[PDB]
């Protein structure tokens, strides 16, 4: 179910791109690459979930 969501939202696309770039660049530290994808994921999840207080 989570995979379905990541696919639809383009996050799995970002992951594929990230891994390909990592491989092409000689498999150096994934720290920065991972951080960037994680940031996009968090933004996308927050947006789609409709995150707000109960009051809101």
């Amino acid at each position: 179910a989570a995979g379905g969501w990541l696919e639809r939202q383009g996050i799995f696309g970002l992951v594929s791109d990230a891994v390909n770039a990592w491989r092409e660049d000689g498999q150096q530290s994934i720290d920065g690459i991972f951080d960037q994808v994680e940031s996009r994921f968090v933004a996308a999840w927050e947006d789609d979930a409709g995150l707000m207080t109960y009051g809101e």
Partner: protein
């Protein structure tokens, strides 16, 4: 962010009915009413009203 339950206003049907009235070259501006069919009822009435407030 908005809830799914707030994404569909009465005005949307009014816009469609304006498109409709436009095609059929009718003059009467059609208004949409959605209220309990009587006071305190869980039964609802969707009414289409003309400029004279007649139920069409």
């Amino acid at each position: 962010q908005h809830l799914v339950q707030t994404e569909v206003p009465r005005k949307l049907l009014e816009e469609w009915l304006a498109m409709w009235s436009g095609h059929y070259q009718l003059k009467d501006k059609l208004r949409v009413q959605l209220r309990p069919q009587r006071a305190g009822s869980e039964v609802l009435e969707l009414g289409i009203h003309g400029e004279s407030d007649d139920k069409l």
